[PDB]
Ligand binder design. Sequence first.
Ligand code: MG
Ligand code: MG
Lengths: 406, 408
Amino acid sequence: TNFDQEALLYHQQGKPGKIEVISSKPCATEKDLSLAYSPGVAAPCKAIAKDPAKVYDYTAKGNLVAVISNGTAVLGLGNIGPAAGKPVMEGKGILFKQFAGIDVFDIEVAATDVDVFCNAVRVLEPTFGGINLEDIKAPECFEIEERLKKEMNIPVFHDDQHGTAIVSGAALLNACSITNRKMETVRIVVNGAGASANSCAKIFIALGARRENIIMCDSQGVIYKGRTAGMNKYKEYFASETEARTLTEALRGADVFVGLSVAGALTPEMLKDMAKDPIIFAMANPEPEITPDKARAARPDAIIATGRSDYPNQVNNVLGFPSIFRGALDTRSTQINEEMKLAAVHALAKLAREDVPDKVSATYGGKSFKFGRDYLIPKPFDTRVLLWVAPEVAKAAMKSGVATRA
Amino acid sequence: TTNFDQEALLYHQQGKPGKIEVISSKPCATEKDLSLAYSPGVAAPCKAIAKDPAKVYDYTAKGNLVAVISNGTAVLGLGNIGPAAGKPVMEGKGILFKQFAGIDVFDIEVAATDVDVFCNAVRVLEPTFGGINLEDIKAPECFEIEERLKKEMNIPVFHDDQHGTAIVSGAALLNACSITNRKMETVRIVVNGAGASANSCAKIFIALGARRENIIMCDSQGVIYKGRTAGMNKYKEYFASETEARTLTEALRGADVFVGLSVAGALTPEMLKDMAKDPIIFAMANPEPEITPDKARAARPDAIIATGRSDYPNQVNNVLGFPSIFRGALDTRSTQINEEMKLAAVHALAKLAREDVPDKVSATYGGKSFKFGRDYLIPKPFDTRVLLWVAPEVAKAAMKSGVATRAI
Ligand SMILES: [Mg+2]
Ligand SMILES: [Mg+2]
C-alpha cells in the first residue's frame, strides 16, 4: 500500500515520532536558568510543600493528561504489546493538543495483569491532571478503570469504553427528536460485547431509555438471563428477559440498532422488520454493518450513523474526550463522572441543531448541512465543539461537587 | 533573598502554568494530516514494531526521550517534601536536558517511598522511554533503587545526584593534580559528608588511579574509621579507613584534597593551614560553600578551589555530565550507562578544559578571559564544545564495552 508507505515515512522522517517537549518559558541565559532550575526553582517547591493545591499554579499539571496503555487492544490490531502501541498513544496525544489544547505524556506500560498495571499507574498521580486509558482489552479494561477511579484522586477515563456511547447517545437523542420518539419507549438492540457495548446501554438508560427495552447480543446471539455459554459478569448485568435468542428475532420491531460487530451483520431482512424510521448505528470498522445506501435501498426511512467520515453522521470519538478533559481540567476536578458525561451528550446534541457556519461548509467541500436525518451531530472538525461542550462539562463538575476550582 | 524567590514564583506562573509544553513535530492540522498521525495510517508503524521491536526507535520519540523520575524524598536541599512539591524541579531538570543535549523529557513524579513499589512502577515503563534519569531520591533508598533498576531494565538508568558531582569533580581533580604535578596514586583525599554523592566520588577517584588507603571519608560524627559502629551502615563502612584521625581537623593535616559535600563553614582556615602544599579544595556545600575562594586564598595563597556556585571559578555543575552522557547512550541505543561510560565522560571533560578557550566562550561570559590553570580546571557550563567532546566519547565507550545496540 502506498498509503502505508506514506504513514511510515511520516513517522520516520525528520525528528522520529510525532512529539517534542519544549520550554514554555525563557531558558537561554544564566539568569533564566537560575529561575527554571537551582536556586530559584526551590521557591515554587516550597510553596507547594506548604499548600499542595499550588502544584496547579506552578507546574504543567493542570493541562497535562497521561494517555496510558498496555497495548493489549491497539486499534483493530489486537494484543500487539506496549511498544507497538506507542505510535497510537503519541497520536492520541496529538488529538488532545489539536482539539483541546491539552498537553499529553503518552505512557506505554508493560503490564497485562490488572493489579500490577493498576499498582504501577496509580502512583503516577502527582504528575498528571487526568488519565486517559486507551487500547486496553476487555474484560481487563473494565476492572482497571473501576479500580483506578477508586484509588486515584484525579480523573480516570477509558475513551474506548465511553467515547462511542457519548457521541452515539447525542446522535440518538436527535434521531428520536426528529422521529417523534420518547426515550422511555424506544427499543434498542446492541450487537457486540466489546469494550464500548455496556457503556452504550448505560448512557442510553441515563438518557431515559428503559433497561427492559434494551437487548444486548454477542457472537453467540442474544444475551438472556439464565444463559451460561460465553457469559461473564459484564454481559450478565444487561441480560434480557426477552424470549429472543438471535439478533434477527431481537430486531423485529426494534427502533434502534447499535452495531459494534462486523460488516454485513445487518441484513435487509432484519432491516425489513424494524419499526418505521429505523435508527441504525453501524459502528463496525473498517467496514460498517451496512452502508447508508444499502440501508436506504432496503428501508428508505432508515436513519444511519457510522464510524466513517465518508458518510453523514460520523460517530467520531474526537467529539467527546477533548471537551470532557478540557472541562475536567479547567475545574481541577477529581473525577470525570456520569454527570459530566451526560452533560457532554446533551451539549453535543444541542450543537447539531444550531445553524452550520460558513467555514464548516468550507472545511467539508462546500457541503451544506442542516439539522435532520443527514446531520444529527456536529462534524469532527467543527471548531465550535470545544466552546460548546467543555463549559457544560465544567458546569456539571461544579454542580456535582467534584470541581476543586470555581 | 525572598524577592528572588518572588522572581522565580512569577516565572513559574506567567503565561502558561509550569515550564513545559508538548507539541507535534509533524503536520497535524488537516484530516489528511491526521489520517497519518492517527487512524488509519498510524496502524502501519504499529504493525512494523510488532514484527520488529527495535523499530520503536524509528517511528516514535523513544530514541530521544528520557524520563526524569523522582519520589521527591530529597529535593535539592529541601529534603523530603514529596512528589508534587518536587515537580518544578523535575520539569526544570527536563529543561536542562533539552537545552544542553536536545533531549526530550517526560518528568514523572511518583508517590512511592517503598523501594519495591517504586521499582515495580518504574520498571514497567521501559517501553515508553529511551533512558531513565533518577533524581532527588533520598539515601539509602536511592542506592537500592538504582542498583535494582539498572539490573532489571534494558535501557540506561542513571541517578544523577549520586554520580554527577563525582564525574565532574573527578575531571576537575585530574586537572588539579596535573597542574600541581601530582600522581593520582599518591594523592590523599578527604571526603566530608556522607550523602548520596559521597561513595560515588570515592569510586570515581579510584577509577582515576587513587588508592583506598589514601581516601578518608567523614560525616556528622567525624571520621568514618574501620571498626566504627556509631551511626554506621552498609555504605559508610565500604570506605572506612585505618587512620588514627577521628576529627575532620585531624584528617586534613598533610592532606592534598578536601571534598566538601557538607555545610557552610565546615572548612576553617586552621585546618586549611595544615594541608599539603598546593591544597585542592572542592567546596560543594549548597548554597554556601564550606569556604569561599577568597577566604581560602587568604588562609592559603597556594590553594586551588572549586565550588557549586556559578559565582566563582571552577563550578562543579552537574549539567556538564548528564546531558552528554544520555546523548551518547541514546544515540548508540545502549542498554546501560556503565562505569566505562562514566569514566569516558570524566576524561573528556578534563581534556576539554586543557584546550585553548575560543572567543565564543569569552563572549558568552561577558568577555572574561579563560586559560587552563588554577582558575579554570573544568569547562564552563555554557561552552557548546562540551556536548561535542563528551557525547562521542560516551558513545565510543558504550560500543567498546558492548552495551551499544547501534554503531555510530
Ligand atoms: Mg483506542
Ligand atoms: Mg537533584
